Design an enzyme around this catalytic site. Sequence first.
Site, PDB file in Angstrom:
ATOM      1  N   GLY B 106       0.795  -1.212   0.000  1.00 33.28           N
ATOM      2  CA  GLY B 106       0.000   0.000   0.000  1.00 33.28           C
ATOM      3  C   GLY B 106       0.830   1.267   0.000  1.00 33.28           C
ATOM      4  O   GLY B 106       0.308   2.355   0.259  1.00 33.28           O
ATOM      5  N   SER B 107       2.128   1.131  -0.281  1.00 31.84           N
ATOM      6  CA  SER B 107       3.053   2.263  -0.370  1.00 31.84           C
ATOM      7  C   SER B 107       3.104   3.064   0.927  1.00 31.84           C
ATOM      8  O   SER B 107       3.239   4.289   0.902  1.00 31.84           O
ATOM      9  CB  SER B 107       2.705   3.179  -1.548  1.00 31.84           C
ATOM     10  OG  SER B 107       2.463   2.434  -2.726  1.00 31.84           O
ATOM     11  N   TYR B 118      -6.083  -8.764   0.930  1.00 31.41           N
ATOM     12  CA  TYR B 118      -5.014  -9.431   1.663  1.00 31.41           C
ATOM     13  C   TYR B 118      -5.508 -10.602   2.501  1.00 31.41           C
ATOM     14  O   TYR B 118      -4.743 -11.541   2.751  1.00 31.41           O
ATOM     15  CB  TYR B 118      -4.283  -8.421   2.550  1.00 31.41           C
ATOM     16  CG  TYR B 118      -3.544  -7.363   1.761  1.00 31.41           C
ATOM     17  CD1 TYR B 118      -2.559  -7.715   0.847  1.00 31.41           C
ATOM     18  CD2 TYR B 118      -3.841  -6.017   1.919  1.00 31.41           C
ATOM     19  CE1 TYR B 118      -1.884  -6.756   0.120  1.00 31.41           C
ATOM     20  CE2 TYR B 118      -3.170  -5.050   1.194  1.00 31.41           C
ATOM     21  CZ  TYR B 118      -2.194  -5.425   0.297  1.00 31.41           C
ATOM     22  OH  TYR B 118      -1.523  -4.465  -0.425  1.00 31.41           O
ATOM     23  N   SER B 182       5.124  -5.255  -1.503  1.00 30.16           N
ATOM     24  CA  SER B 182       5.400  -3.844  -1.764  1.00 30.16           C
ATOM     25  C   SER B 182       6.206  -3.206  -0.638  1.00 30.16           C
ATOM     26  O   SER B 182       7.376  -3.546  -0.436  1.00 30.16           O
ATOM     27  CB  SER B 182       4.093  -3.079  -1.987  1.00 30.16           C
ATOM     28  OG  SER B 182       4.311  -1.680  -2.005  1.00 30.16           O
ATOM     29  N   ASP B 280       7.263  -3.572 -14.311  1.00 32.90           N
ATOM     30  CA  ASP B 280       7.172  -2.612 -13.222  1.00 32.90           C
ATOM     31  C   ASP B 280       8.266  -1.566 -13.391  1.00 32.90           C
ATOM     32  O   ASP B 280       9.409  -1.901 -13.714  1.00 32.90           O
ATOM     33  CB  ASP B 280       7.303  -3.309 -11.865  1.00 32.90           C
ATOM     34  CG  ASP B 280       7.003  -2.387 -10.703  1.00 32.90           C
ATOM     35  OD1 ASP B 280       6.121  -1.514 -10.845  1.00 32.90           O
ATOM     36  OD2 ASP B 280       7.644  -2.540  -9.643  1.00 32.90           O
TER      37      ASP B 280
END
Lengths: 438, 334
Positions: B106-107, B118, B182, B280
Amino acid sequence: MDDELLAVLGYKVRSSEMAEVALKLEQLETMMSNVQEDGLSHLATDTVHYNPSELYSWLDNMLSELNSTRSVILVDSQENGVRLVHALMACAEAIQQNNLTLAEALVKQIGCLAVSQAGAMRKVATYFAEALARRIYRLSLSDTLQMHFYETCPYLKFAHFTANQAILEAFEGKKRVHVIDFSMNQGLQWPALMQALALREGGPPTFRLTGIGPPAPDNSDHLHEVGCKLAQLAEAIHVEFEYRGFVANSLADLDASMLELRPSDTEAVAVNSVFELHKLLGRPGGIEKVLGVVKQIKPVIFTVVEQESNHNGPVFLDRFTESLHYYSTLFDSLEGVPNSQDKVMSEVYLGKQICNLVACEGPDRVERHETLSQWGNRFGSSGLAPAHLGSNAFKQASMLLSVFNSGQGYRVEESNGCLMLGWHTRPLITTSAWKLST
Amino acid sequence: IESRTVVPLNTWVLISNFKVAYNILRRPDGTFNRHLAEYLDRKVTANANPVDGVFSFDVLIDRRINLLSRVYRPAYADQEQPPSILDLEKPVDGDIVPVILFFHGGSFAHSSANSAIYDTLCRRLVGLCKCVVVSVNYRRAPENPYPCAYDDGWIALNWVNSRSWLKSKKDSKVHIFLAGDSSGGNIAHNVALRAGESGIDVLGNILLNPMFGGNERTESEKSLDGKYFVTVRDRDWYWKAFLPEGEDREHPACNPFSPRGKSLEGVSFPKSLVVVAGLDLIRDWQLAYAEGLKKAGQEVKLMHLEKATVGFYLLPNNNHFHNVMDEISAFVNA
Ligand SMILES: C=C1C[C@]23C[C@@]1(O)CC[C@H]2[C@@]12C=C[C@H](O)[C@@](C)(C(=O)O1)[C@H]2[C@@H]3C(=O)O
């Protein structure tokens, strides 16, 4: 037919509307590339969003405006808590198996164990032990308590705020309105809605209020006092106000003939209910009659606040364990409040609720709670349709929580167009709104 | 139209919807709209009744910081009755039982442990790796910037290591693997560093598209900008929202192999499994991280999927998902 892979993730998309939805997303991106930050700020501030699960309608709105589940949470306890739960469930099983001789020794052992504990488990075990003793020995004031509960716990304020927001949205652009309350109580909900009506764009409407209450043993006229106190503030802010009240022993004794209704084209009607419908489940055919009366009224909105827990099962032991989970969560949440008289009065109120839940049976049992799925099934069978709540109500409730509680971990969630209040990840109460099915 | 030919239609819809919502939620002055973000987020509840052989429950690890986690366990074969209290924390029956401490992406600003994307991933991990999963709910930026998430992960690791019902019967120890998505991979790397510094022993690391960066612009950043759901602008915004005040992207929390970072040579570090997607725009930083791990003398396996984008593991409709699940299962059950 929806997309199963997307449905598991929480999004409702029809299989035949896939490409269409994709196209809409395209049209959004280009739009957001030619509008810059003005439209983005408008969407983040002024727009109101509804039902995020259904992407089709949400994308349409954005394009228009830019142009049996068992939930448990465990808190750190000690070995005494483990033994206390062991003994409580053992006593419940002994009662179910009709022992009635091991039950007395088990309840005395429960008291002995609970003597040497600390926290919410002590109070929970104490109240459940009194309830169990009452049950086995049967086998062989309120206004002040509710005021203290209102002062100490955030559930009543949340219910009032969400219901009032829904009613205000449903009453927009009207000149004559009427409110029918099944949970009149002391009238702690209405002044804020009345102020909001008086502070409207275009002019406030005309207000009529109906309040239904139980028959008091002393037959006190509290409804008249509440009505006059409301009328004072009504005339304070230049609102045309009319008030009227009833006494009834059950909501199944009501009919639309005694409500003194006016033509629908002349007056709009909103029905309210906060922690009152589950008491109609004791009567074998009560909820159907009340829902039929509600349908006969033909309101513009029907607001319901309830408790989210399955406490109306056919087996006593399952109800016992579910209620034990729920009330342990409630007392764990109540741990964080500073000590005061209102806190102990709220604890007494909850203990009375537990005693009624465990001991009584038949019509004498009124604390028959249910979950959102069962309530929705009943309402859909009655001929109603959901009225989804927006992001503004969510923001108002969140800001109320962040002010009146601050440190305690209460959270707001959105699900199926309804709002949920819970402690951390465990939901506790639910607010929903309904309208007439087309 | 370029990203339309590399993914299935439903995956494209999911990623595009996330992209537009996150476009709405960001403000130019470094401000976040948390209320609307929480309203839009889809969530699910824990269920103690076993569904598809998996049941879950929640635990309040810490009360001062409101730190919480969710536990996923396989269904009991011997007990047909569904589990309840006094049975949720029953001791594990097995000579070797791996336990995965998972961190979601989620950065550093979006999503939670109860998000519906999730929860499904954790249940799939339980069903495919035959293990127990603990998912942490860590604090998010910019309201809780660095280093809140690292501290949350450390506390969760200590809590997992101190449980007596999670101990294996072959050595009376807890077999622990750290996994991350992430920014979760970033958290997992830092928590593994701290655990190696302390007396806790971590057996392995799994990093799915780890979040790393730097001051310079890589070739993939300049060539893939805005073509596969991710742009440089939002990466800069998120790094600014996470990092301390007046700090550039050479901070060790951004670049693990920066000059200000700590050398990994001669350091107790677990074996790593890093998965890199070809489509990416920050793939260069991930490849550099893998190369730096290899150069320091550590054991690392690199999985480079040349035609994969972000979020290929959220839906089981591609070969990348199946292959990555196979390699993860072989990695934890070695
Ligand atoms: C701004 C964002 C954040 C994304 C990339 C993106 O550029 C667009 C969509 C985000 C995201 C949404 C859900 C998942 O958490 C994530 C890992 C992904 O696949 O896509 C998320 C992913 C991320 O957190 O890196």
